[PDB]
Symmetry: D2
Subunit: 251 residues, 4 copies
């Protein structure tokens, strides 16, 4: 039995890392999937590496581009039918303390990590409510929405915003019987291009004082909890935080 | 396609309500299960409803009886092989505020809800560590381990204890590369005999000021998260809290 | 006897409501205080209502105005000497679900509630670090930085961002021995002009299902926890959340 | 001029003869409260009381917090000395350096009888004795950062402090819904220099590592006393069911 039977998903930033693995396991469990990203070559190769146009397709869309979001839903519904599932995964990092954060860096990171999740959640509610789809919006927070990090100040702001904004949306949808659920996923450190391109990041976060398991995670670790959250298995889960972090926040 | 292929699970209180559904879906995903209960009559047919002696068996056992835990593991192990999965689900309730709680009520509830979880977790670590089994201890807390209830004082105490004790155990297992994960599950109100017997409770907890979804969940809602937590899909999840509560704690 | 002897505090949005009472009790405990606000008429009287130019002054400044923050510190230090204490209290509300929030409303609320706190915290760290001042940055979050509200989506986002960004700042100041602490305050409902102008709000949040105490608080309730956080009494408190909410988030 | 922040209050501080409790007793008296401190060792207890003030403001009572019957005599004794009790600090607690795996059942029951049952006995009796008297009554239950995060080598302690954390919310809610005029809150110290820490070899050094306490040092008993003063005063009349964390940044990372 396919765990995402009948589901049609948008996965922002689905061409690399966590987003790519969410896409991969979404198709594996029966979902039609549109992945987005900014770079077209990367995006088209990523999509075909999972399957053909009958199951998965790439759409060039910056998650911070408000107007492009309506085209994204229209295109996705054209190819596969009504969207049932939105994974707001696109996100960037900035290695600066609050003290050392430039306003340009601040605004740039928030435009993607916060405005883009807002745009996808607001539009996802409008387009998916009251259709009996078992709709599910999965917003990618982080353990950095739960704890602080002295060199990720703007990132911390954005992931904590996503954490609580998601509860507002969850509550509204539940109280209004919209048949739309909203939850946040909080990965610990995961081996991705994001982490690979940060020199010494994996060794640093593999320290026992950081990740008690003594190693960082893999993209599939996050894909599988997103499968649970996209599926009707989680029909009673809303407004909740799902932490897959090697024990990071437990100490 | 069997998400729990090769797993051997103990499920305390697995003859009614949430425990019964956990066993049901554990076997559907390929796991041998031993369920426990104090009443041999109710417990014997409960085992048969899911299947036969090649998948599931009943073992009479009070969760607060420390010596029986050793017999429970021995019994399970020669029946099905080395135990891989422990779901500490057995629990009782008392409808008293802290002020109105008698010491006998206090002690009785904690012997099951706190001592029993301790016995299963402690022995579960001893018997499952260092065997490459992908061991998982799943400790049933509650939303009542996350927020208070004015007339569930003893219950709140037990569920907050389970919440943080599981983190201790998760951290020690991770730091010692024991290959045992420990997580807690936090159901909101769920239609079970425990709830069916408290008169007017389902209606009370279906109010929007309690559960935002306007209804209470079903035992299968808790079964599917335990499936995720018992499987190797969650191998980076330890010391974390998984909340399935219809939005109850999100407001 | 004076619990804030020698302290020099900037209190943004100090002309009404909570900020006014913070300023009041700060001057009462021997702090020198600059309050800010947008309306000069209201602000000059607000300052005069507490004391003369020797203990308190008003500066017209919009917390979203980044360049003005540098002038605001300069003006405060000219008047009273080096700033020891920054209370990022200016904030606004928008009564819209996520689904109904206009992008105009989103950007406007975040410019005050989030950018304003970022500007104040970042400059505060730069201007107060390494000067033996027992410096303290107090960032005004809300219970709405902890739980969601279906009709305050952007507000929830802002208060969640403030909650976790403040931890980042607290950690970096602690690790670098800056002698700057950073904490967040999380009021529940408080009788202020913000609540009074919102028709039916006080009645709604006084419901026992919302505030278990059956009434909302008053500005001095937040003033006194801010005095504690500004004083050297709290020299071991950093990165933490101080909730004064009538029991709102305890259920 | 300023004013005694605990004028008219009457406090019971369990385990108030050493460490955090002693500092809570000391600053409670400084702020105008009348205090009874408890402890198991009368020698330590009687000198503790005398070091803070006379019997007009503070007295010692030998009492084991696990001893339910003694709680009644304790409140009776405090009433006769000072008047109706207004403030209960459930501070007595002990530790056990064992993982969950390595905890003997005897270590388990002993720690919980003090850390959990003792806080239950004091909270329940505090409510019964202080409800409906308009005293501005406040129950302060001593949890820990170890009621918020785990520690691999304090499994029973973690259990006890997580229980205190949530049981206090139950009591806060019932008290508020019933208009008892009794607030209940928990305090969560990070590592604090006390006899409990001093007697654990290498504990202060371990918890001074930046990976544990970002401030690079542990706190002192007055750090906890001053938040308890706030919680006992009518200044916190709108605070109930909440967690007050004074930990040098430990749980912020
Ligand atoms: N890696 C971790 O340790 C970790 C931990 C916790 C949370 N997270 C979160 O999980 C999410 C995935 O992170 P990751 O580690 O997989 O990052 P990654 O390896 O850098 O992948 C980034 C993906 O997002 C796309 N992307 C970047 N900017 C975008 C924009 N403006 N609009 C649309 N798409 C964009 C990228 O494609 P293009 O470059 O072609 O646009 C790429 O497909 C992020 O939200 C991150 O904050 C990551
Ligand atoms: N129902 C809810 O809304 C809800 C919500 C959150 C959390 N929970 C938690 O989830 C767990 C299951 O609750 P439920 O609603 O399924 O309870 P339930 O309907 O009362 O079923 C409890 C099961 O536990 C067994 N049990 C009772 N006392 C026992 C003991 N001393 N030793 C061993 N087994 C015992 C019972 O069998 P016998 O009668 O034969 O002993 C029964 O099989 C509990 O830990 C509860 O605290 C429940
Ligand atoms: N009241 C509650 O129940 C409650 C609960 C939780 C949190 N809070 C938070 O507490 C803080 C104060 O709220 P309140 O209820 O006291 O609000 P209020 O009664 O509306 O007072 C707000 C104060 O901030 C000033 N202000 C508004 N916009 C500003 C800007 N852009 N720059 C500088 N100052 C500005 C106002 O003066 P001008 O209008 O003249 O500028 C006024 O002095 C806010 O951060 C709010 O989010 C309030
Ligand atoms: N120190 C820390 O770093 C830290 C951090 C977080 C929380 N805490 C908590 O803070 C509280 C105080 O700890 P502390 O570090 O100040 O401990 P401490 O220095 O060991 O002092 C403990 C006090 O409690 C008394 N006590 C011990 N067992 C008792 C019992 N059964 N009944 C009554 N009194 C008893 C002791 O007196 P006798 O010796 O006369 O019995 C002593 O007066 C405890 O709840 C602890 O769990 C401590
Ligand atoms: O992007 C990241 C990351 C990179 C490297 C280590 C930890 C983390 C984390 O927690 N998030 O969200
Ligand atoms: O025992 C209970 C209960 C009873 C009635 C409604 C909800 C709940 C819950 O969440 N737990 O744990
Ligand atoms: O501004 C507010 C407010 C107004 C009225 C009721 C509750 C609240 C709250 O929680 N915040 O933050
Ligand atoms: O009792 C203690 C203790 C002792 C030594 C170091 C840390 C801690 C702590 O967090 N609690 O609660
Ligand atoms: Mg902006
Ligand atoms: Mg709540
Ligand atoms: Mg931590």
């Amino acid at each position: 039995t396919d765990r995402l039977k009948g589901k049609v998903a948008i996965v922002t930033g689905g061409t690399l890392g966590i987003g790519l693995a969410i896409a991969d396991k979404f198709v594996e469990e029966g979902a039609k999937v549109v992945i987005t990203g900014r770079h077209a070559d990367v995006g088209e190769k990523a999509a075909k590496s999972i399957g053909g146009t009958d199951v998965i397709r790439f759409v060039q869309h910056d998650a911070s581009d408000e107007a492009g979001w309506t085209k994204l839903f229209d295109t996705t519904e054209e190819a596969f039918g009504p969207v049932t599932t939105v994974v707001n995964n696109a996100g960037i990092a900035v290695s600066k303390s609050v003290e050392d954060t430039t306003t340009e860096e601040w605004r740039k990171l928030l435009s993607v990590n916060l405005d883009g999740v807002f745009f996808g959640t607001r539009l996802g509610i409008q387009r998916m409510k009251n259709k009996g789809l078992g709709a599910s919006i999965i917003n990618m927070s982080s353990i950095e929405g739960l704890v602080g990090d002295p060199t990720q100040g703007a990132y911390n702001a954005s992931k904590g915003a996503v954490r609580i904004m998601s509860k507002s949306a969850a509550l509204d949808c539940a109280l209004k019987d919209y048949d739309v659920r909203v939850n946040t996923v909080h990965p610990g450190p995961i081996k991705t291009p994001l982490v690979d391109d940060a020199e010494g990041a994996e060794e640093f976060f593999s320290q026992r004082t950081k990740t008690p398991m003594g190693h960082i995670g893999e993209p599939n670790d996050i894909a599988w909890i997103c499968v649970y959250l996209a599926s009707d298995e989680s029909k009673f889960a809303t407004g909740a935080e799902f932490v897959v972090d090697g024990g990071y926040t437990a100490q």
